Amino acid sequence: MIFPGATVRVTNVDDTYYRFEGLVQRVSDGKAAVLFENGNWDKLVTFRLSELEAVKPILEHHHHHH
C-alpha cells in the first residue's frame, strides 16, 4: 500500500527518473503524483503505482508493551 506522504522510487527503466526517489503528493485517478525536490528545483510528475516502489522512511524506534 502507498499513500500521499510516502517516499517512492521510480523503477521504470525507460524513464528519466529511473532509480530516483520522490514523494507521493496525492493519488490522481489511481495514479500517484510524485514530487521530486532538490532544495529549490522541483517537478511534480504523476506515475502509476505499478511504476513505483516504496522506499524506507527514517529509522524511528517503535515500541509497545503489555
Side-chain angles (χ1 to χ4, degrees):
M1 61 182 60
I2 305 177
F3 304 105
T7 321
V8 291
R9 166 174 276 130
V10 183
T11 28
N12 188 320
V13 186
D14 190 37
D15 191 83
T16 311
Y17 294 111
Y18 172 71
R19 198 197 189 213
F20 289 100
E21 302 168 274
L23 188 66
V24 180
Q25 291 299 270
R26 60 183 59 178
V27 180
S28 302
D29 290 286
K31 293 182 179 182
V34 184
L35 186 63
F36 305 94
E37 217 293 276
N38 200 85
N40 179 267
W41 169 85
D42 78 280
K43 185 184 180 185
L44 190 157
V45 187
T46 320
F47 296 102
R48 308 173 187 129
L49 280 286
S50 51
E51 306 313 304
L52 303 169
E53 58 172 51
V55 200
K56 274 61 176 174
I58 314 80
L59 287 309
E60 302 180 79
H61 187 95
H62 66 261
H63 65 101
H64 284 123
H65 67 108
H66 60 266

Short mmCIF file of all heavy atoms in Angstrom, two decimals:
data_model
loop_
_atom_site.label_atom_id
_atom_site.label_comp_id
_atom_site.label_asym_id
_atom_site.label_seq_id
_atom_site.Cartn_x
_atom_site.Cartn_y
_atom_site.Cartn_z
N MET A 1 0.84 -1.22 0.00
CA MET A 1 0.00 0.00 0.00
C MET A 1 0.87 1.25 0.00
O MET A 1 1.91 1.30 0.66
CB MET A 1 -0.94 0.01 1.22
CG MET A 1 -0.21 0.02 2.56
SD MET A 1 -1.32 -0.04 3.98
CE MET A 1 -2.17 -1.59 3.67
N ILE A 2 0.45 2.26 -0.75
CA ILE A 2 1.15 3.52 -0.83
C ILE A 2 0.16 4.67 -0.65
O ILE A 2 -0.97 4.59 -1.13
CB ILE A 2 1.90 3.69 -2.17
CG1 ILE A 2 2.83 2.50 -2.42
CG2 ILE A 2 2.69 4.99 -2.19
CD1 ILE A 2 3.56 2.55 -3.75
N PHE A 3 0.58 5.72 0.05
CA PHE A 3 -0.30 6.84 0.36
C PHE A 3 0.43 8.16 0.11
O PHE A 3 1.65 8.19 0.02
CB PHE A 3 -0.75 6.77 1.82
CG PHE A 3 -1.43 5.48 2.19
CD1 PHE A 3 -0.76 4.53 2.94
CD2 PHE A 3 -2.73 5.23 1.79
CE1 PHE A 3 -1.38 3.34 3.28
CE2 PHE A 3 -3.35 4.04 2.13
CZ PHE A 3 -2.68 3.10 2.88
N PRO A 4 -0.32 9.27 -0.02
CA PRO A 4 0.28 10.60 -0.11
C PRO A 4 1.10 10.93 1.14
O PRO A 4 0.57 10.98 2.25
CB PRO A 4 -0.93 11.54 -0.22
CG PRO A 4 -2.04 10.67 -0.70
CD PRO A 4 -1.79 9.32 -0.11
N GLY A 5 2.39 11.13 0.94
CA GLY A 5 3.28 11.33 2.06
C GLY A 5 4.28 10.20 2.20
O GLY A 5 5.09 10.18 3.12
N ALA A 6 4.20 9.23 1.28
CA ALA A 6 5.13 8.11 1.27
C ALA A 6 6.22 8.31 0.23
O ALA A 6 5.96 8.84 -0.86
CB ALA A 6 4.38 6.81 1.02
N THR A 7 7.43 7.91 0.58
CA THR A 7 8.57 8.03 -0.31
C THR A 7 8.61 6.87 -1.30
O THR A 7 8.51 5.71 -0.91
CB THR A 7 9.88 8.06 0.51
OG1 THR A 7 9.67 8.82 1.71
CG2 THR A 7 11.01 8.66 -0.30
N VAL A 8 8.75 7.18 -2.58
CA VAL A 8 8.74 6.16 -3.62
C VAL A 8 9.89 6.33 -4.59
O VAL A 8 10.40 7.43 -4.79
CB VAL A 8 7.41 6.17 -4.41
CG1 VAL A 8 6.26 5.69 -3.54
CG2 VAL A 8 7.13 7.56 -4.96
N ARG A 9 10.30 5.22 -5.19
CA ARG A 9 11.36 5.22 -6.19
C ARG A 9 10.81 4.75 -7.53
O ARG A 9 10.02 3.80 -7.59
CB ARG A 9 12.51 4.32 -5.72
CG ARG A 9 13.51 3.97 -6.82
CD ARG A 9 14.70 3.21 -6.26
NE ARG A 9 15.72 4.10 -5.71
CZ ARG A 9 16.28 3.97 -4.51
NH1 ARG A 9 15.87 3.02 -3.67
NH2 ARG A 9 17.24 4.80 -4.13
N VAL A 10 11.20 5.44 -8.60
CA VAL A 10 10.74 5.09 -9.94
C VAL A 10 11.54 3.92 -10.49
O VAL A 10 12.75 4.02 -10.70
CB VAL A 10 10.86 6.29 -10.90
CG1 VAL A 10 10.31 5.95 -12.27
CG2 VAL A 10 10.16 7.51 -10.33
N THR A 11 10.86 2.80 -10.71
CA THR A 11 11.51 1.59 -11.17
C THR A 11 11.23 1.31 -12.64
O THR A 11 11.41 0.18 -13.11
CB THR A 11 11.06 0.39 -10.32
OG1 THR A 11 9.75 0.64 -9.80
CG2 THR A 11 12.04 0.15 -9.18
N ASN A 12 10.80 2.33 -13.37
CA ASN A 12 10.60 2.21 -14.81
C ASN A 12 11.90 2.58 -15.52
O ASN A 12 12.34 3.73 -15.47
CB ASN A 12 9.43 3.09 -15.27
CG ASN A 12 9.06 2.86 -16.73
OD1 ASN A 12 9.92 2.69 -17.60
ND2 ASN A 12 7.76 2.83 -17.01
N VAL A 13 12.50 1.60 -16.17
CA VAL A 13 13.84 1.74 -16.74
C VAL A 13 13.86 2.74 -17.90
O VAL A 13 14.87 3.39 -18.14
CB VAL A 13 14.38 0.38 -17.23
CG1 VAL A 13 15.83 0.49 -17.68
CG2 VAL A 13 14.24 -0.67 -16.13
N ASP A 14 12.74 2.87 -18.59
CA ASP A 14 12.68 3.73 -19.78
C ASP A 14 12.21 5.13 -19.41
O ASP A 14 11.69 5.88 -20.24
CB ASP A 14 11.75 3.10 -20.83
CG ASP A 14 11.82 3.80 -22.18
OD1 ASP A 14 12.93 4.22 -22.58
OD2 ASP A 14 10.77 3.90 -22.85
N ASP A 15 12.40 5.51 -18.15
CA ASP A 15 12.03 6.86 -17.72
C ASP A 15 13.27 7.64 -17.32
O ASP A 15 14.33 7.07 -17.06
CB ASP A 15 11.03 6.81 -16.56
CG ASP A 15 10.43 8.17 -16.28
OD1 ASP A 15 9.45 8.55 -16.96
OD2 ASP A 15 10.95 8.88 -15.40
N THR A 16 13.14 8.96 -17.29
CA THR A 16 14.24 9.84 -16.91
C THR A 16 14.55 9.73 -15.41
O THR A 16 15.70 9.84 -14.99
CB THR A 16 13.91 11.30 -17.25
OG1 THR A 16 13.44 11.38 -18.60
CG2 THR A 16 15.13 12.20 -17.09
N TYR A 17 13.52 9.48 -14.62
CA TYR A 17 13.66 9.45 -13.17
C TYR A 17 13.85 8.03 -12.64
O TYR A 17 13.56 7.75 -11.48
CB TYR A 17 12.46 10.10 -12.50
CG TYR A 17 12.35 11.59 -12.78
CD1 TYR A 17 11.34 12.09 -13.58
CD2 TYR A 17 13.27 12.48 -12.24
CE1 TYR A 17 11.24 13.45 -13.83
CE2 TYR A 17 13.19 13.83 -12.49
CZ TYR A 17 12.17 14.31 -13.29
OH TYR A 17 12.08 15.66 -13.55
N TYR A 18 14.36 7.15 -13.49
CA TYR A 18 14.67 5.79 -13.07
C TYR A 18 15.67 5.80 -11.92
O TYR A 18 16.68 6.51 -11.99
CB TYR A 18 15.21 4.97 -14.24
CG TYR A 18 15.73 3.60 -13.83
CD1 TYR A 18 14.86 2.60 -13.44
CD2 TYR A 18 17.09 3.33 -13.84
CE1 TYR A 18 15.33 1.36 -13.05
CE2 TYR A 18 17.57 2.09 -13.46
CZ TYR A 18 16.69 1.11 -13.07
OH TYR A 18 17.16 -0.12 -12.68
N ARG A 19 15.36 5.05 -10.87
CA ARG A 19 16.22 4.90 -9.69
C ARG A 19 16.11 6.11 -8.76
O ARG A 19 16.49 6.04 -7.59
CB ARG A 19 17.67 4.66 -10.09
CG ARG A 19 18.50 4.09 -8.97
CD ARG A 19 19.98 4.25 -9.23
NE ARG A 19 20.79 3.52 -8.25
CZ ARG A 19 21.98 3.92 -7.81
NH1 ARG A 19 22.48 5.10 -8.20
NH2 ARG A 19 22.67 3.16 -6.97
N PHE A 20 15.58 7.21 -9.28
CA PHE A 20 15.43 8.42 -8.48
C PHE A 20 14.26 8.28 -7.51
O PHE A 20 13.35 7.47 -7.72
CB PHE A 20 15.23 9.64 -9.38
CG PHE A 20 16.48 10.04 -10.13
CD1 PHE A 20 16.66 9.67 -11.46
CD2 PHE A 20 17.47 10.77 -9.51
CE1 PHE A 20 17.80 10.03 -12.14
CE2 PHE A 20 18.62 11.14 -10.19
CZ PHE A 20 18.78 10.76 -11.51
N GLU A 21 14.29 9.07 -6.45
CA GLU A 21 13.30 8.97 -5.39
C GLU A 21 12.48 10.24 -5.29
O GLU A 21 13.01 11.35 -5.41
CB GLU A 21 14.00 8.68 -4.07
CG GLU A 21 14.83 7.41 -4.09
CD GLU A 21 15.73 7.27 -2.89
OE1 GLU A 21 16.86 7.81 -2.93
OE2 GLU A 21 15.33 6.61 -1.91
N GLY A 22 11.19 10.08 -5.07
CA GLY A 22 10.31 11.21 -4.93
C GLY A 22 9.29 11.00 -3.84
O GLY A 22 9.28 9.94 -3.20
N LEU A 23 8.43 11.98 -3.63
CA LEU A 23 7.43 11.88 -2.58
C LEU A 23 6.03 11.95 -3.17
O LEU A 23 5.70 12.91 -3.88
CB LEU A 23 7.63 13.01 -1.57
CG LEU A 23 6.77 12.92 -0.31
CD1 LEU A 23 7.16 11.72 0.52
CD2 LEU A 23 6.90 14.20 0.51
N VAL A 24 5.22 10.93 -2.90
CA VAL A 24 3.83 10.92 -3.35
C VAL A 24 3.07 12.06 -2.71
O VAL A 24 2.94 12.12 -1.49
CB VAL A 24 3.13 9.58 -3.01
CG1 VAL A 24 1.68 9.60 -3.48
CG2 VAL A 24 3.87 8.41 -3.64
N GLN A 25 2.60 12.97 -3.53
CA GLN A 25 1.89 14.14 -3.04
C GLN A 25 0.41 13.88 -2.94
O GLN A 25 -0.27 14.39 -2.05
CB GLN A 25 2.14 15.33 -3.97
CG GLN A 25 3.57 15.85 -3.93
CD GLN A 25 3.97 16.35 -2.56
OE1 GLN A 25 3.80 17.52 -2.23
NE2 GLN A 25 4.52 15.46 -1.75
N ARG A 26 -0.10 13.07 -3.86
CA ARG A 26 -1.51 12.82 -3.95
C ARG A 26 -1.78 11.67 -4.91
O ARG A 26 -0.97 11.39 -5.79
CB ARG A 26 -2.25 14.08 -4.43
CG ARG A 26 -1.78 14.57 -5.80
CD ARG A 26 -2.48 15.86 -6.19
NE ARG A 26 -2.23 16.93 -5.22
CZ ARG A 26 -2.70 18.17 -5.34
NH1 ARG A 26 -3.41 18.52 -6.41
NH2 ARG A 26 -2.44 19.06 -4.39
N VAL A 27 -2.89 11.02 -4.69
CA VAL A 27 -3.38 9.99 -5.61
C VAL A 27 -4.24 10.65 -6.68
O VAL A 27 -5.19 11.37 -6.36
CB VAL A 27 -4.20 8.91 -4.86
CG1 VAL A 27 -4.70 7.84 -5.83
CG2 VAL A 27 -3.38 8.28 -3.75
N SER A 28 -3.90 10.43 -7.93
CA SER A 28 -4.62 11.05 -9.03
C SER A 28 -5.22 10.00 -9.95
O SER A 28 -4.53 9.42 -10.80
CB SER A 28 -3.69 11.98 -9.81
OG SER A 28 -3.15 12.98 -8.96
N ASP A 29 -6.51 9.74 -9.76
CA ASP A 29 -7.28 8.80 -10.58
C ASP A 29 -6.63 7.43 -10.64
O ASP A 29 -6.63 6.77 -11.68
CB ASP A 29 -7.47 9.36 -11.99
CG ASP A 29 -8.41 10.54 -12.03
OD1 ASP A 29 -9.64 10.34 -11.89
OD2 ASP A 29 -7.94 11.69 -12.21
N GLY A 30 -6.10 6.99 -9.51
CA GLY A 30 -5.49 5.67 -9.45
C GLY A 30 -3.99 5.72 -9.61
O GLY A 30 -3.30 4.72 -9.38
N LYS A 31 -3.48 6.87 -10.02
CA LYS A 31 -2.05 7.08 -10.15
C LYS A 31 -1.51 7.82 -8.93
O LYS A 31 -2.28 8.20 -8.04
CB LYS A 31 -1.77 7.89 -11.41
CG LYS A 31 -2.09 7.17 -12.71
CD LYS A 31 -1.73 8.03 -13.91
CE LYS A 31 -2.01 7.32 -15.22
NZ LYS A 31 -1.61 8.14 -16.39
N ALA A 32 -0.21 8.04 -8.89
CA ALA A 32 0.41 8.74 -7.78
C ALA A 32 1.27 9.89 -8.28
O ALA A 32 2.15 9.69 -9.13
CB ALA A 32 1.24 7.78 -6.94
N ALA A 33 1.02 11.09 -7.77
CA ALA A 33 1.77 12.26 -8.17
C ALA A 33 3.07 12.35 -7.38
O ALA A 33 3.05 12.63 -6.18
CB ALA A 33 0.94 13.52 -7.97
N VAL A 34 4.17 12.07 -8.05
CA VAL A 34 5.47 12.04 -7.39
C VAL A 34 6.17 13.38 -7.51
O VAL A 34 6.37 13.90 -8.61
CB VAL A 34 6.37 10.94 -7.99
CG1 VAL A 34 7.69 10.83 -7.23
CG2 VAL A 34 5.64 9.60 -8.00
N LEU A 35 6.54 13.94 -6.38
CA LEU A 35 7.27 15.19 -6.35
C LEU A 35 8.75 14.94 -6.16
O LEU A 35 9.16 14.25 -5.22
CB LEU A 35 6.77 16.08 -5.21
CG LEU A 35 7.36 17.49 -5.18
CD1 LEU A 35 6.99 18.26 -6.44
CD2 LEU A 35 6.91 18.23 -3.94
N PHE A 36 9.54 15.50 -7.05
CA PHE A 36 10.99 15.49 -6.90
C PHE A 36 11.44 16.86 -6.44
O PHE A 36 10.96 17.88 -6.95
CB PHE A 36 11.68 15.11 -8.21
CG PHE A 36 11.19 13.80 -8.79
CD1 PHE A 36 10.17 13.78 -9.73
CD2 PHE A 36 11.75 12.60 -8.38
CE1 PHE A 36 9.72 12.58 -10.24
CE2 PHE A 36 11.30 11.40 -8.90
CZ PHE A 36 10.28 11.39 -9.83
N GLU A 37 12.34 16.90 -5.47
CA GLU A 37 12.74 18.15 -4.84
C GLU A 37 14.24 18.13 -4.55
O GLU A 37 14.76 17.14 -4.04
CB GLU A 37 11.94 18.32 -3.54
CG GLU A 37 11.53 19.75 -3.23
CD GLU A 37 12.70 20.65 -2.92
OE1 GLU A 37 13.16 20.67 -1.76
OE2 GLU A 37 13.18 21.35 -3.84
N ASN A 38 14.93 19.22 -4.90
CA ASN A 38 16.38 19.28 -4.72
C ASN A 38 16.79 20.56 -3.97
O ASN A 38 17.93 21.01 -4.06
CB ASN A 38 17.07 19.21 -6.09
CG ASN A 38 18.53 18.79 -6.00
OD1 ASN A 38 18.84 17.60 -5.96
ND2 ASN A 38 19.45 19.75 -6.00
N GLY A 39 15.85 21.14 -3.23
CA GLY A 39 16.17 22.29 -2.41
C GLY A 39 15.80 23.60 -3.06
O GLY A 39 16.15 24.67 -2.55
N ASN A 40 15.08 23.52 -4.18
CA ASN A 40 14.66 24.69 -4.95
C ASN A 40 14.10 24.23 -6.28
O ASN A 40 13.05 24.68 -6.72
CB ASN A 40 15.82 25.67 -5.20
CG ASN A 40 15.40 26.87 -6.02
OD1 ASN A 40 15.52 26.88 -7.24
ND2 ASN A 40 14.88 27.90 -5.36
N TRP A 41 14.83 23.32 -6.92
CA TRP A 41 14.37 22.71 -8.16
C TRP A 41 13.38 21.61 -7.85
O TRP A 41 13.57 20.83 -6.91
CB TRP A 41 15.55 22.16 -8.96
CG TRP A 41 15.15 21.29 -10.12
CD1 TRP A 41 14.79 21.70 -11.37
CD2 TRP A 41 15.06 19.86 -10.13
NE1 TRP A 41 14.48 20.62 -12.15
CE2 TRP A 41 14.64 19.47 -11.42
CE3 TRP A 41 15.30 18.86 -9.17
CZ2 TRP A 41 14.46 18.14 -11.77
CZ3 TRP A 41 15.12 17.54 -9.53
CH2 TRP A 41 14.70 17.19 -10.81
N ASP A 42 12.32 21.54 -8.64
CA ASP A 42 11.29 20.54 -8.45
C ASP A 42 10.56 20.27 -9.75
O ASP A 42 10.66 21.04 -10.71
CB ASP A 42 10.27 20.99 -7.39
CG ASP A 42 9.27 22.00 -7.91
OD1 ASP A 42 9.60 23.20 -7.99
OD2 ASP A 42 8.12 21.60 -8.21
N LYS A 43 9.85 19.15 -9.78
CA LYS A 43 8.99 18.80 -10.90
C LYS A 43 8.06 17.67 -10.48
O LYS A 43 8.48 16.53 -10.31
CB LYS A 43 9.80 18.37 -12.13
CG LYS A 43 8.94 18.12 -13.35
CD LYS A 43 9.75 17.59 -14.53
CE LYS A 43 8.86 17.35 -15.75
NZ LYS A 43 9.61 16.73 -16.87
N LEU A 44 6.79 18.01 -10.29
CA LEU A 44 5.79 17.02 -9.92
C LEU A 44 5.38 16.22 -11.15
O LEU A 44 4.89 16.79 -12.13
CB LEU A 44 4.57 17.72 -9.29
CG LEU A 44 3.53 16.81 -8.63
CD1 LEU A 44 2.73 17.58 -7.60
CD2 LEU A 44 2.59 16.22 -9.67
N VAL A 45 5.60 14.92 -11.11
CA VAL A 45 5.25 14.04 -12.21
C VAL A 45 4.41 12.88 -11.71
O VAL A 45 4.82 12.16 -10.80
CB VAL A 45 6.50 13.49 -12.93
CG1 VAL A 45 6.11 12.72 -14.18
CG2 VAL A 45 7.47 14.61 -13.29
N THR A 46 3.24 12.71 -12.28
CA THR A 46 2.35 11.64 -11.88
C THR A 46 2.71 10.34 -12.59
O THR A 46 2.85 10.30 -13.82
CB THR A 46 0.89 11.98 -12.19
OG1 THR A 46 0.63 13.36 -11.91
CG2 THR A 46 -0.06 11.11 -11.37
N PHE A 47 2.86 9.29 -11.82
CA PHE A 47 3.17 7.96 -12.34
C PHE A 47 2.12 6.98 -11.85
O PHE A 47 1.22 7.35 -11.10
CB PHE A 47 4.55 7.48 -11.88
CG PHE A 47 5.70 8.30 -12.38
CD1 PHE A 47 6.32 9.23 -11.55
CD2 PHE A 47 6.18 8.14 -13.67
CE1 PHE A 47 7.39 9.97 -12.01
CE2 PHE A 47 7.25 8.88 -14.13
CZ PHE A 47 7.86 9.80 -13.29
N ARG A 48 2.24 5.73 -12.26
CA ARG A 48 1.35 4.70 -11.77
C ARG A 48 1.91 4.12 -10.48
O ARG A 48 3.10 4.28 -10.19
CB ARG A 48 1.19 3.57 -12.78
CG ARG A 48 0.81 4.02 -14.18
CD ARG A 48 0.87 2.84 -15.14
NE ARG A 48 0.67 3.24 -16.53
CZ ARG A 48 1.49 2.89 -17.52
NH1 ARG A 48 2.59 2.19 -17.26
NH2 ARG A 48 1.22 3.24 -18.77
N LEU A 49 1.07 3.43 -9.73
CA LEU A 49 1.51 2.73 -8.54
C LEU A 49 2.38 1.56 -8.95
O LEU A 49 3.31 1.17 -8.24
CB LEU A 49 0.29 2.24 -7.74
CG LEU A 49 -0.41 3.29 -6.87
CD1 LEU A 49 0.42 3.61 -5.64
CD2 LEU A 49 -0.72 4.56 -7.65
N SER A 50 2.07 1.02 -10.12
CA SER A 50 2.85 -0.05 -10.70
C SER A 50 4.22 0.46 -11.11
O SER A 50 5.17 -0.32 -11.24
CB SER A 50 2.11 -0.61 -11.92
OG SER A 50 1.73 0.43 -12.80
N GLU A 51 4.34 1.77 -11.29
CA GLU A 51 5.59 2.34 -11.77
C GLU A 51 6.54 2.66 -10.62
O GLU A 51 7.70 3.01 -10.84
CB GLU A 51 5.35 3.62 -12.58
CG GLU A 51 4.38 3.46 -13.74
CD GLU A 51 4.66 2.24 -14.59
OE1 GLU A 51 5.79 2.11 -15.10
OE2 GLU A 51 3.74 1.40 -14.75
N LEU A 52 6.04 2.53 -9.40
CA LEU A 52 6.79 2.94 -8.23
C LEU A 52 6.97 1.79 -7.25
O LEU A 52 6.20 0.82 -7.25
CB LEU A 52 6.04 4.07 -7.53
CG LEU A 52 5.76 5.30 -8.40
CD1 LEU A 52 4.80 6.23 -7.69
CD2 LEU A 52 7.06 6.02 -8.73
N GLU A 53 7.99 1.90 -6.42
CA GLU A 53 8.15 1.03 -5.26
C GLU A 53 8.40 1.89 -4.03
O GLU A 53 9.00 2.96 -4.12
CB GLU A 53 9.28 0.02 -5.45
CG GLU A 53 10.64 0.63 -5.73
CD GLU A 53 11.75 -0.41 -5.73
OE1 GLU A 53 11.61 -1.43 -6.43
OE2 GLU A 53 12.75 -0.21 -5.00
N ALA A 54 7.92 1.43 -2.88
CA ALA A 54 8.02 2.21 -1.66
C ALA A 54 9.41 2.10 -1.06
O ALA A 54 9.96 1.01 -0.93
CB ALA A 54 6.97 1.75 -0.65
N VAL A 55 9.98 3.24 -0.69
CA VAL A 55 11.28 3.27 -0.06
C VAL A 55 11.11 3.26 1.46
O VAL A 55 9.98 3.34 1.96
CB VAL A 55 12.11 4.51 -0.49
CG1 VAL A 55 13.60 4.30 -0.23
CG2 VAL A 55 11.87 4.84 -1.95
N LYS A 56 12.20 3.17 2.19
CA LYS A 56 12.15 3.14 3.64
C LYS A 56 12.23 4.55 4.21
O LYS A 56 13.05 5.36 3.77
CB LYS A 56 13.29 2.28 4.20
CG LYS A 56 12.98 0.79 4.28
CD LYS A 56 12.67 0.18 2.93
CE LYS A 56 12.44 -1.32 3.04
NZ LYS A 56 12.01 -1.91 1.74
N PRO A 57 11.37 4.87 5.19
CA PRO A 57 11.38 6.16 5.88
C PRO A 57 12.53 6.26 6.88
O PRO A 57 13.44 5.42 6.88
CB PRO A 57 10.04 6.18 6.61
CG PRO A 57 9.73 4.75 6.86
CD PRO A 57 10.30 3.99 5.69
N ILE A 58 12.49 7.27 7.72
CA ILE A 58 13.51 7.44 8.76
C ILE A 58 13.38 6.31 9.77
O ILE A 58 12.29 5.77 9.98
CB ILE A 58 13.39 8.80 9.50
CG1 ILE A 58 13.19 9.98 8.52
CG2 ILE A 58 14.63 9.06 10.35
CD1 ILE A 58 11.77 10.15 8.02
N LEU A 59 14.48 5.97 10.42
CA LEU A 59 14.50 4.83 11.31
C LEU A 59 14.10 5.23 12.72
O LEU A 59 14.95 5.50 13.58
CB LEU A 59 15.88 4.15 11.32
CG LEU A 59 16.24 3.34 10.07
CD1 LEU A 59 15.13 2.36 9.72
CD2 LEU A 59 16.54 4.25 8.88
N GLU A 60 12.80 5.32 12.95
CA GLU A 60 12.27 5.59 14.28
C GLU A 60 12.35 4.34 15.13
O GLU A 60 12.38 3.22 14.61
CB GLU A 60 10.81 6.04 14.19
CG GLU A 60 10.58 7.27 13.34
CD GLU A 60 9.12 7.66 13.30
OE1 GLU A 60 8.63 8.27 14.27
OE2 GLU A 60 8.44 7.32 12.31
N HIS A 61 12.38 4.52 16.44
CA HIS A 61 12.36 3.39 17.35
C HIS A 61 10.94 3.15 17.84
O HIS A 61 10.47 3.82 18.76
CB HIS A 61 13.30 3.61 18.54
CG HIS A 61 13.44 2.40 19.43
ND1 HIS A 61 14.46 1.48 19.30
CD2 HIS A 61 12.67 1.96 20.46
CE1 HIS A 61 14.31 0.53 20.20
NE2 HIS A 61 13.23 0.79 20.91
N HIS A 62 10.25 2.21 17.22
CA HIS A 62 8.90 1.87 17.64
C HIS A 62 8.95 0.88 18.79
O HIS A 62 9.86 0.06 18.86
CB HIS A 62 8.07 1.32 16.47
CG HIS A 62 8.53 -0.01 15.93
ND1 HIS A 62 9.32 -0.14 14.81
CD2 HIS A 62 8.30 -1.28 16.36
CE1 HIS A 62 9.55 -1.42 14.57
NE2 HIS A 62 8.94 -2.13 15.50
N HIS A 63 7.99 0.98 19.70
CA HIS A 63 7.95 0.09 20.86
C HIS A 63 6.56 0.07 21.48
O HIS A 63 5.87 1.09 21.52
CB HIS A 63 8.99 0.51 21.92
CG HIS A 63 8.75 1.85 22.54
ND1 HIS A 63 8.19 2.02 23.79
CD2 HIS A 63 9.01 3.10 22.08
CE1 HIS A 63 8.11 3.30 24.07
NE2 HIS A 63 8.60 3.98 23.05
N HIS A 64 6.15 -1.10 21.94
CA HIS A 64 4.90 -1.26 22.66
C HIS A 64 5.13 -2.19 23.83
O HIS A 64 6.13 -2.90 23.88
CB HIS A 64 3.79 -1.81 21.76
CG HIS A 64 3.21 -0.80 20.83
ND1 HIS A 64 3.19 -0.96 19.46
CD2 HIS A 64 2.60 0.39 21.07
CE1 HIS A 64 2.60 0.08 18.90
NE2 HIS A 64 2.24 0.91 19.86
N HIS A 65 4.21 -2.19 24.79
CA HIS A 65 4.35 -3.04 25.96
C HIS A 65 2.99 -3.44 26.51
O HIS A 65 2.00 -2.73 26.32
CB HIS A 65 5.18 -2.34 27.05
CG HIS A 65 4.52 -1.14 27.65
ND1 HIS A 65 4.01 -1.13 28.93
CD2 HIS A 65 4.29 0.10 27.15
CE1 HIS A 65 3.49 0.06 29.19
NE2 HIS A 65 3.65 0.82 28.12
N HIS A 66 2.95 -4.57 27.18
CA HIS A 66 1.74 -5.04 27.82
C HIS A 66 1.98 -5.18 29.32
O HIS A 66 3.02 -5.75 29.70
CB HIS A 66 1.26 -6.37 27.21
CG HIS A 66 2.23 -7.52 27.32
ND1 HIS A 66 3.13 -7.84 26.32
CD2 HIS A 66 2.42 -8.43 28.30
CE1 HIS A 66 3.83 -8.90 26.69
NE2 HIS A 66 3.42 -9.28 27.88
#
